[PDB]
C-alpha cells in the first residue's frame with residue numbers, strides 16, 4: 003500500500019474516532035445548561051441531581067473528546083504538508099480564529115464549572131456552563147467553515163507567482179453557502195445525538211426504577227429528563243430534514259460528482275429513481291426523492307451521470323480518475339439517511355408511554371432504549387464519511403463558479419513520507435484510540451448503571 | 463513589511479505563554495510519582511493533592527499549544543508544513559503523551575481500584591515526561607537548523623535529530639519544568655506536601671542550573687544574536703535568585719516568579735536566536751525559510767491581527783481570573799474522600 007492510501011486511512015480513522023465524542027459534547031452541553039438553569043429558576047432538587055448525574059457523563063465524554071482532537075490539529079502538517087502550503091493562507095485563518103474564539107473559552111470555563119460548584123456564586127457558575135455551550139457551537143462553525151472551503155472554495159484566488167491560494171475577503175469565506183448549511187446541519191445532528199442519549203439513559207432508568215430498585219424519588223426525577231430528551235430529539239429531527247434538504251440544493255450545483263455518487267448513476271438521467279439496495283441491480287427504487295433533494299421539485303431535473311461527468315472533468319482538468327468510491331459513499335449515505343428511523347421511532351414511543359404522568363414498566367422498552375444510543379453516533383459518522391469520501395479525487399474541490407485554478411488532488415497534497423514511517427503512526431493511533439474508546443464505553447456503562455450518586459442528593 | 467515581524471513575535475508570544483503555563487503542568491505531572499514514594503502518610507493523598515493544583519487550569523493551559531500551532535499554520539504556512547513534516551517522529555511521541563495525559567487526568571478518580579489508578583498514573587507520567595523532554599529537543603533542532611534543499615524538502619537523518627546539542631535541550635527543558643513544577647506546588651499548597659515540594663526543588667536547583675546555563679550558553683555562543691546576551695544574563699540572574707529562594711525558604715511567590723522568568727528567558731532566547739529564519743538550512747543559508755518568504759499574504763496577516771488584538775487580551779483577561787478564583791491553597795485535609803466506584807459492580 004502506497005503512502006497516499008495509508009495517510010488517507012490514518013486521517014479518516016483519527017478523525018472518525020474524534021467525532022464519536024464530538025456530537026455528544028455539542029448537543030449535551032446546551033442540555034446540561036438548560037437543566038442547570040431550570041434548577042436555578044425553580045430550585046427543584048430533582049434538576050440538581052440530573053445536572054450532577056449527566057454532568058459526570060458529559061465530563062467523561064469531554065475528556066476523550068479533547069484528547070482525540072489534539073492529533074487533528076497537527077495532522078495537516080505531518081502528513082499533508084504539500085496541501086497545507088496550498089490552502090494554508092486561507093485555511094489557517096478559520097482554524098486560528100477557532101482556537102482564540104472557542105477553544106480558549108470552552109477549555110477555560112469547563113474547568114470553572116467543574117470546580118466552581120461551591121466556590122462561585124450560583125449565577126456566575128450558571129454562566130460558566132452557558133459560555134461552554136456557546137463556545138462548543140462556535141467551535142463547530144469555524145471548523146466546519148474551514149472544511150466548507152475545501153468542499154466549495156470561495157473568497158480566495160490562485161496566485162501563479164507563489165502557486166498557492168490566497169485570501170481575498172474573510173467575510174466571504176465565513177459566509178459561503180456550504181459553511182452555513184453544513185454548520186446548521188451538524189449542530190442539528192449533535193442535538194439529536196445528545197437528546198437521544200439523554201432520553202435513552204433516562205427511559206432505561208425509568209424502567210429500571212419501576213421494576214427494580216423501587217423508589218418514587220428517582221423515577222419522579224428522570225421522567226422530566228426523558229420528556230426533555232424526547233422533545234429535543236424530535237426538534238432536532240425536524241431541523242435535520244430542513245437542513246438536509248438545503249444541503250442537497252448546494253451539493254447538486256456545487257459538486258455534481260458527489261450527487262451522482264449518492265445514487266450511483268452510471269449515465270445522465272432525467273428524474274432519476276432512488277434505489278435502496280444494490281449489488282447494477284437497483285433493488286426497491288424510490289422516485290420523487292432525488293429531484294426534490296436536487297431542487298425541491300418533484301420532476302423537471304436532469305442529473306449528470308458518473309460517466310458523463312468523468313469525460314467532462316477529464317477534458318476540463320486533465321487525465322485522471324475522478325470517480326469516488328461509489329460503494330462507500332452510496333452505503334454511507336444510505337446508512338446516514340436510514341438511521342433516523344431508530345431515534346425518531348424511539349422518541350415517539352417514549353413520549354406515548356410517559357403520557358399523562360404514567361411511568362413505563364416494559365422490559366422491551368429498556369432494550370429499545372439501549373439499542374437507540376448507538377444510532378445517532380453511527381448516523382453522524384456516516385454523514386461525515388459520505389461528504390469526505392464523496393469528494394475523494396479532490397482535497398480542494400474546484401468551484402464551478404469560482405477560480406478554476408483553486409483545486410488540488412489528494413495525491414498532490416500528501417507529504418513525502420516513507421511508507422514505513424506512516425505505517426507505524428497509523429498503528430500507534432489505531433490501537434491507542436481503540437483502547438481509549440473501549441475504556442470510555444466501559445466508564446459510561448459503569449456510571450449509567452449507578453445513576454444518581456448518594457453524595458449528589460442534596461444541593462446544600 | 464511590519465506585519466510579518468509582528469506576527470512572528472505573536473507566535474513567539476503564544477509559545478512563551480504555553481511554556482509559562484504548561485511549564486508547571488508538566489512539572490506537576492513529572493513530580494507526582496516522586497511525591498508518592500517520598501511523601502509520608504498514604505501515597506494516594508499526596509498524589510491527589512499535587513494533581514488537584516492544576517486540576518481546573520490544565521485544560522485551559524494546553525489550548526495555548528493548540529492555538530500556537532493554529533497561528534503558525536495561519537501566519538506562516540511554509541513554517542508549519544516544513545517543520546511538522548520534518549519532525550514527524552519526535553512530534554508523534556509528544557502527541558502520544560498528550561493524548562494519554564488528557565484522558566488520564568479526568569479519568570483517574572472515576573474508579574476506585576489500585577490497578578486503575580496505576581494505569582492513570584502512567585498516562586500522566588508518560589504524558590509529561592515525553593512533552594517535557596521532546597519540546598526541548600524540538601526547539602533545539604529549529605535553532606540548530608534542518609537540511610533543507612532548494613525545493614523545500616528535508617530528507618532528515620538520525621544525526622540531525624539526536625545530536626549532543628539537541629539532547630542537552632531535552633534534558634534542560636525537562637529539568638527546568640521539573641523545578642518549575644516543584645516551586646509551583648510549594649506556592650499552591652500547604653502542609654507537609656509543601657515541605658516535600660521544597661525538598662524536591664533543592665535537589666533540582668543545582669543540576670538544572672548547570673543544564674540551563676550550559677544549554678543557554680551554548681545557544682547564545684553558537685546561534686545567538688548580539689542582544690540575546692541580555693536575555694541570557696537575566697536568565698542567569700533570575701536562576702541565581704531562584705536557587706537562593708528555594709534553599710532559603712523566605713517566600714513562595716518570589717521563588718515561583720524567578721523560575722517563571724527563567725522559562726520565559728529561555729523561550730525568548732530560542733526565538734531571539736531564530737529571528738530572521740524560521741527553519742535555518744544546514745545545506746545552504748539561501749534556501750533557509752524566512753519570515754519574508756514563508757509568511758501569508760498581507761491581507762491574511764492584517765485580518766488575523768484584528769482577531770488576535772481583541773481576543774488575546776481577552777483570553778489573558780479571564781485566564782488570570784480563573785487562577786485568582788482558585789488562589790486558595792489546598793492541603794491534604796481539604797481533599798475530599800475518593801468518589802470512584804468499585805471495579806466489580808455489586
Ligand SMILES: CCCCCCCCCCCCCC(=O)OC[C@H](COP(=O)(O)OCC(O)COP(=O)(O)OC[C@@H](COC(=O)CCCCCCCCCCCCC)OC(=O)CCCCCCCCCCCCC)OC(=O)CCCCCCCCCCCCC
Nearest residue numbers: 467468471472474475478687689730733734737770771774
Ligand atoms: C497585538 C497582539 C499582541 C502582540 C503581543 C506582543 C507582540 C510582540 C511583537 C514583537 C515585535 C518584534 C518586531 C521586530 O523585532 O522586528 C525587527 C526589528 C528590526 O528590524 P531590522 O530592519 O531587521 O533591523 C536591522 C538589523 O537589526 C538587522 O540585523 P541584526 O541581526 O543586527 O538585528 C536583528 C534583530 C534586531 O534586534 C533588536 O534590535 C531589538 C532586540 C529586542 C527585540 C525584542 C525582544 C525583547 C522583548 C521581549 C520582552 C518583552 C517585555 C517583557 O532582530 C530583532 O529585532 C529580534 C526580534 C525577535 C524578538 C522575538 C522575541 C519574542 C518576544 C515575545 C514577547 C511577547 C510578550 C507578550 O526589531 C526592532 O527593533 C523593532 C522593535 C522591537 C521592540 C519589541 C517591543 C515589544 C515588547 C512587547 C511588550 C509585551 C507587552 C504587550
Ligand SMILES: CC(C)=CCC/C(C)=C/CC/C(C)=C\CC/C(C)=C/CC/C(C)=C\CC/C(C)=C\CC/C(C)=C/CC/C(C)=C/CC/C(C)=C/CC1=C(C)C(=O)c2ccccc2C1=O
Nearest residue numbers: 010011014015018330333334336337340341343383384387
Ligand atoms: C432502519 C435502519 C434501516 C437501519 C439500516 C441502515 C443501513 C441501511 C445501513 C447500511 C450499512 C451497511 C450494510 C454497510 C455500511 C458500509 C460502509 C462502508 C459504511 C461506513 C462506516 C460508517 C458509516 C461508520 C464507521 C462506524 C463507526 C463510526 C464506528 C464503529 C465502531 C467503533 C468503536 C469503531 C472504532 C473506530 C474504527 C475502527 C474506525 C475505522 C472505520 C472508519 C473510520 C472508516 C472510514 C473510512 C472508510 C469506510 C473507507 O473506506 C476509507 C477508504 C480510504 C481512506 C479512508 C477511509 C476511511 O476513513
Ligand SMILES: CCCCCCCCCCCCCCCCCCCC(=O)O[C@H](COC(=O)CCCCCCCCCCCCCC)COP(=O)(O)OCCN
Nearest residue numbers: 006007008010011322323324325326327328329330394395
Ligand atoms: C484487510 C485485508 C485487505 C487485503 C485483502 C483484499 C480485500 C478485498 C476487499 C476490498 C475490495 C475489493 C478490492 C478493492 C480494489 C481497490 C479499491 C477499489 C477501487 C476504487 O475504485 O476505489 C478506490 C478506493 O481506494 C481506497 O482508498 C480504499 C481502498 C479500498 C478499501 C475501502 C474500505 C471499504 C470498507 C470499509 C469498512 C468500514 C469499516 C468500519 C466498520 C479509489 O480509487 P483511486 O481514486 O485511488 O484511483 C486511482 C487510479 N490511478
Ligand code: HDD
Nearest residue numbers: 024027067068071072074075105109138141142145188528
Ligand atoms: C463539528 C464540530 C467539530 C468538528 C468537525 C471537529 N471538531 Fe474538534 N472539537 C470540537 C468540535 C469539532 C469541539 C466540540 O469543539 C470539541 C469537542 C469536545 C471538545 O473538546 O471540543 C473539539 C475539540 C478539539 C480540540 C481540542 C480542543 C481543546 O483543546 O480544548 C482540537 C485540537 C480539535 N477539536 C481539533 C479539530 C480538528 C483539527 C478537526 C479537524 C477536522 C476537528 N477538531 C473537527
Ligand code: HEM
Nearest residue numbers: 010013014017018021145146149386387390391394397412
Ligand atoms: C474540519 C473538519 C475536517 C477537515 C478539515 C477535514 C479534512 C480532511 C482532509 C484534509 C482529509 C484528507 C484528504 C482526504 O482524505 O481526502 C480528510 C479526509 C477524511 N476525512 Fe476529513 N476533514 C474534516 C472532518 C472530518 C470528520 C469530522 C470526519 C469523520 C468523522 C472526517 C472523515 C474523513 C475521512 C474518512 C477522510 C478520508 C477520506 C478520504 O480519504 O478522502 N473528516 N478530511
Ligand code: HEM
Nearest residue numbers: 184188191246247249250253338339342381382385386389
Ligand atoms: C433526510 C436526512 C438527511 C439528509 C437529507 C441528509 C443530507 C445530508 C447531506 C446532503 C449531507 C452533506 C453532503 C455534502 O455536503 O457533501 C449530509 C451530511 C451530513 N449529515 Fe446528513 N442527512 C440526513 C440525515 C442526517 C442525520 C440524521 C445526521 C446525524 C445524526 C446527519 C448528519 C450529517 C452529518 C454529520 C453530515 C456531516 C457533513 C455535513 O456537514 O453535511 N445526517 N447530510
